[PDB]
Design a protein around this ligand. Structure first.
Ligand code: HEM
Ligand code: HEM
Ligand SMILES: COc1ccc(CO)cc1OC
Ligand SMILES: [Cl-]
Ligand SMILES: [Cl-]
Lengths: 363, 362
């Protein structure tokens, strides 16, 4: 190809319809500062630095003063940009924490930004969820990704405490096949094409009915979903395919030849994952990554799962009904448990000369 | 190229092999009572490893829908990505709590013992040791994890998993020395892994050891937390002084290039490089950075180095360096060892033999 540089500036924030990279670092933060003007400072600086990290500009580093810290941590000096994207979102608690509109922003609050409803089978750790700000960092190289997060978080010392940092991977096939999750199934097929503007306009991107700063933005849902690999791996192929209602290998819906053939609902169990998701009639854009965090001390097996991230213009319409219908009855519940949860509103894109969330934080 | 690294040969791969980007590193404790069980394990591990590393896909559509799939499937569409798997054995494999469980004492390597305690250690016992270690490397995380997962699946009933760590280390886009999380080039001081004579002198067992160890080596493992927040707010002067090399160039102080010989008289004597180089000893370092979320005990990134090095004789090459460093290293300010192990790596496997056969007996 050419180079791996994804624009930072644009109508939309990168990292959403951007072709899905291999690695993610996913972080949520709380603001401890009390003035809005501290926040403007954080967003201005986050903006300058994201532009620089994603563009491929390297900091010269001829430090005028040996006695100060280097402005960059340096572990990416010799690395390509690797399609780095950084996407920012704001949780409900940014607009109103514990009854208080801390920053005078409750009137610019997005139409559908609220914590997700409790669902059956949830086993949420509150500290593994929520947050005032999320940063989603993606790249084709784990070290490029970590470097961007670390340097971004360094800038937030004084203003924000870091709540959690997750990270994940998902490898696409050598010839561009749909990437497989840890259950060994193709994961993404049902997404519409990220290159179809019409469909992305109708499924993902905010155009009306929200505060101006959300124009060209979207909502991001996050669910941290542990996957029980040892249970799954001991299951028959029949149980695996029936759980989803596609064939493992081909990815095709039952009774069909190809991955991309329409789902025949009447040929798949009612409570198969695909049946339940498709049957709400609604669409989202899933952009998830697998994770592993070593051994689970409470299990003695691998701690592994899915960092479920989806984008949608109206989560009340598009997402929560899906969540409701799967949480009750999904065959997949046999093999998974949700342990983290958040919904964030992601601002529209940054224009050159403005900063992220400006039309929110100003005037 | 084709991205295939031979599994069979004089040595195990993953030691002098070019450093891949990703690692998964596991240790297991044998729970089986009979050597014959361990023999089964090693046989399976062998044939499975050869498949995984070779580029061979299962690619034979399952008969009997009612059985578990033999492979977990998530590497079906991936390149083998230079995958290597390296096995080793800890002391407790040969003798646990003064009992020779599998009748192997008399085949025990000359230099295999738990590493001595050192100042500034804060070892978690459950984050080192183990009877067996598996080091899995590849240029793609998903490939490496798949390999580990399917190896470990085979071990169910024979072993319990002690711990699984994983990490990364990206080489420069033009083949520059990879940088660690402190942002310094990491590996300049190793000899060329392409020089058989040097590797023979430093890494590979040729004599003085049981036969199964011929072509093998010893693997030292040190899990070292790196306090990135402490380091990032340090001055550049302090960071360079910690090592005795310039961050950017990687040059020894007062020299022009990375490859230039260190001048000991030009670097601080408590500097990392001065202390290491001054034992006059040599090792082959093949380490990986790790990140493991927020450390709850500090609210900062939990991050570090999976220090891994290879040496024909640890008592001569490695234990000294450790001694030399542990009390005076400037790095002590920014790091803390929290896990430790030493393991003996069998010589390579021949086509038709299994790993550690000569130790186990066939
Ligand atoms: C560990 C958790 C999960 C796994 C392993 C998983 C896996 C899968 C797989 C294998 C498919 C079929 C291929 C595809 O179209 O991607 C699929 C489809 C889908 N999943 Fe999931 N999923 C998980 C959680 C969720 C959650 C929480 C949601 C929504 C709330 C969700 C929504 C969907 C949707 C909308 C589809 C597409 C249905 C259609 O064809 O229209 N998934 N998922
Ligand atoms: C977090 C822990 C560590 C870090 C970040 C680290 C980093 C470095 C760096 C930046 C260098 C100089 C460039 C190079 O030659 O690679 C170096 C050299 C070296 N380190 Fe370390 N190191 C660590 C732990 C250790 C330990 C535990 C040992 C052995 C006990 C060790 C042994 C050496 C040796 C032998 C050299 C080469 C000295 C020579 O030039 O001959 N390192 N290390
Ligand atoms: C890529 O060269 C290396 C760089 C770093 C290490 C770990 O210190 C090992 C290397 O090759 C054996
Ligand atoms: Cl059903
Ligand atoms: Cl590191």
């Amino acid at each position: 190809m050419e180079e791996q540089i994804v624009p930072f500036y644009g109508k939309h924030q990168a990292g959403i319809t951007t072709a899905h990279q291999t690695y993610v670092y996913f972080a949520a933060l709380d603001v401890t500062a009390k003035e809005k003007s501290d926040i403007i400072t954080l967003f201005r600086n986050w903006t300058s630095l994201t532009q620089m990290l994603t563009s491929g500009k390297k900091m010269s580093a001829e430090q005028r003063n040996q006695y100060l810290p280097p402005q960059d941590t340096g572990e990416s000096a010799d690395l390509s940009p690797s399609n780095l994207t950084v996407t920012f979102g704001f949780g409900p608690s940014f607009f109103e924490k514990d009854g208080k509109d801390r920053f005078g922003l409750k009137s610019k609050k997005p139409k559908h930004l609220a914590a997700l409803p409790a669902m059956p089978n949830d086993n949420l750790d509150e500290k593994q969820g929520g947050g005032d700000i999320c940063i989603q960092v993606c790249a084709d190289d784990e070290q490029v990704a970590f470097h961007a997060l670390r340097n971004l978080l360094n800038q937030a010392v004084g203003t924000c405490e870091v709540r959690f940092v997750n990270k994940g991977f998902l490898s696409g096939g050598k010839n561009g096949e749909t990437p497989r999750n840890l259950f060994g199934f193709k994961d993404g097929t049902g997404n519409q094409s990220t290159e179809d503007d019409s469909l992305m306009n109708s499924i993902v991107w905010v155009q009306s009915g929200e505060p101006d700063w959300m124009t060209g933005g979207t909502y991001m849902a996050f669910r941290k979903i542990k996957m029980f690999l040892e249970i799954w791996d001991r299951s028959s192929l029949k149980d695996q395919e029936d759980t989803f209602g596609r064939r493992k290998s081909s990815g095709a819906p039952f009774g069909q030849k190809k991955e991309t053939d329409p789902v025949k609902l009447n040929q798949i169990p009612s409570n198969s994952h695909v049946s339940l998701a498709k049957s709400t009639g609604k669409q989202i854009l899933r952009r998830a990554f697998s994770y592993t965090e070593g051994l689970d001390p409470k299990t003695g097996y691998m701690d592994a799962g899915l960092l479920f991230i989806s984008f949608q213009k109206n989560p009340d319409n598009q997402f929560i009904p899906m969540l409701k219908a799967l949480s009750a009855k999904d065959a997949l519940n046999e093999y998974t448990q949700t342990i983290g949860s958040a919904l964030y509103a992601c601002p529209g894109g940054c224009k050159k000369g403005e900063y992220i969330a400006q039309r929110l934080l100003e005037s």
